[PDB]
Structures are given as C-alpha cells and as structure tokens.
C-alpha cells in the first residue's frame, strides 16, 4: 500500500504517534517518507544479509525474524512479514519499542539526515486531524 502524506499523518495519529515518548507526529511522517516513500511493502536488502521491511524500513538484524539473517536478535518478537501489511499496526508497535530505547529515533539513518533539526511539523500542515 502506497500512502498519501495526509492519509499517513491521520493513520499515525489514530495509531498513537502524536507525541509518543517526546516525539511529535511530523517526525514519523518525515521518516516514513525518506525511509520507504510511504510504501508499506518496501523491502531493501543490505550488504550484511539483513533486510529492511515496510514503511519504516525496520531491520532484520535487530528487530524481527526473517529466517535469513545470521545473528538476528528479534527484539520486536515479530516475523518480518508482519511488517509488510497494508495495516500499519505491526510497524507502529515495533517502532514504538525501538524508540523507547535511549537512542530514540536516532536508530533511523534517514531521520537523522533528513528530519532531525528541521521543521518537522511542516509534514502535517494541510491535513484535517
């Protein structure tokens, strides 16, 4: 599923990400964009044999099990295909867990480079919430 910016904004708000653990909603919308480009089904394989899954491009070395990745840790306790669904549910739940560690959103390379420090609230301007 490919999302509109405003359609994702509202979904993420429905899924409790406005102001989750100190992060406002534009943070998640911006990251989704630069990670996956609003596509729930994006997959990207890495040099080290791990893959990133879904709208938030969540990595199989740490967060989920794909049965392909060497020393996988499965911190989110979820198979990586759950992260692919048209529903954003699994992806949000797992991103909530990721962000509850001290690193917070610095886990996402794209977010560090594109969103962090910018006027992220821009990403929710326009939509009825």
């Amino acid at each position, epitope marked *: 599923k490919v999302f509109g910016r405003c359609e994702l904004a509202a979904a993420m708000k429905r*899924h*409790g990400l406005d102001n989750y*653990r100190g992060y406002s909603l534009g943070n998640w919308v911006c990251a989704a964009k630069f990670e996956s480009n609003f596509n729930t089904q994006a997959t990207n394989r890495n040099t080290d044999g791990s893959t990133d899954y879904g709208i938030l491009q969540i990595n199989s070395r740490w967060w989920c099990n794909d049965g392909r990745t060497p020393g996988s*840790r499965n*911190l989110c*306790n979820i198979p990586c295909s759950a992260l692919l669904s048209s529903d954003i549910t699994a992806s949000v739940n797992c991103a909530k*867990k990721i962000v*509850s560690d*001290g690193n917070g959103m610095n886990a996402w390379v794209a977010w560090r480079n594109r969103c962090k420090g910018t006027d992220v609230q821009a990403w929710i301007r326009g939509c009825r919430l």
Partner: single-chain antibody
Amino acid sequence: DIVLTQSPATLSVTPGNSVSLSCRASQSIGNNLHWYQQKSHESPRLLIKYASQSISGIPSRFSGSGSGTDFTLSINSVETEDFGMYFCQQSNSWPYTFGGGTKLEITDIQLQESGPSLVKPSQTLSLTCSVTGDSITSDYWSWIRKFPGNRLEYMGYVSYSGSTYYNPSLKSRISITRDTSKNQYYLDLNSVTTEDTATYYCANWDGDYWGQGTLVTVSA
C-alpha cells in the same frame, strides 16, 4: 505524571451480563493504554494492548475502545473466571503509570525472581531475575511492584543499548543492571523504608512474560 482514574471502583455482576470498565487519563495519550487482569497476587495478565488490539490466547469476549483520554474495557457476556482486579496502564510518557484498579466480583521463555523476603530499614534490597528460554540480549526488561493497598508502580526498565529508565518517585535509590553471561538482570533499591514493602515482579517490557512475584517486607 499522567494520572489514570478508573471507575467504577468495584462492580458486582451475574455471569452472562455484559460490562464496561472506564479509564480516563489526565492528558491525551493517543492509543497508548493497555489492560491487565490480576487475581489476588498473581502476575498480571495482559488482555488488550494499545486501547483496542487483541492479544493471542485471550478470549474473544474481551474488547476495548477509545482514544485521547477516554478508554473502555468491555466484557461481552461475563464468565466466572473473569473475577479479580483490572488495571489500565499508559505507555505514552515516562514514567509509565497504572490506574487505581477496578474490582470485579462475580455473583519457551520463563522468568524467576530471587531475593530476601525480610529486610531491615535503611538497607539495600537486591533482586535477581533469572531468564530461561532466550537471551536477555533479545528483549527489554522491567521491574514492577504492587503495594499492600493494591497500588501498582512501574519501577523501570533496561533496553538493548544498556540505557535505563527509572521512575522518578524512586529518587535515584534504584539501579537496574544486566549480566549477559549468566542470563540475569538485577534490581537494586538503596535505603529502604517501611514504604517499600510490596510484591516485586520482573517482566519483559512487552508485559507478556512476568515472574511469579515475590513478597518483600521492610520491618523495624
């Protein structure tokens, strides 16, 4: 801290009836509200997560709804097994917090706590949680305690990076550490007072797995 007002305080009911329990929050918390059932000191059991999402192995009849600041646990057609306390918990903001409880009167991986059960005032309480079935490097780990008047308190957790979150009411008396090569994690609570008498539970961050709990008394 986000404060969660649960109501009604107690509720009596005939098997077959439907019920609704209410949780209201002092500030907007999105969908970040979870429900537990606890039968007179046993580990709480997670029933609904994130306001309305099902939990695998939990009976159909339990459902939830709401958002923002109004939340409802529904028991469509009550069974006798459903007796006990019910608690809401937020995870939107640190510290995590628990509602005051609603009494309902009807008409693989294991965790184990070890430590003392009697401690002198002013001493350090040390607890161990031994994990079985997976690596402690494969999750986040929490400590929670239940006070004698039913009150529940989230004490803290340690997360993959080794970073830790502690409840500010413990004012720096608390410490949480891991020993990877033993598959253990630890609670240290300095300078105990009679206030600290409670049942202590270890649990993973998900709230899926809980130890059995252990009673610790602080006594002159």
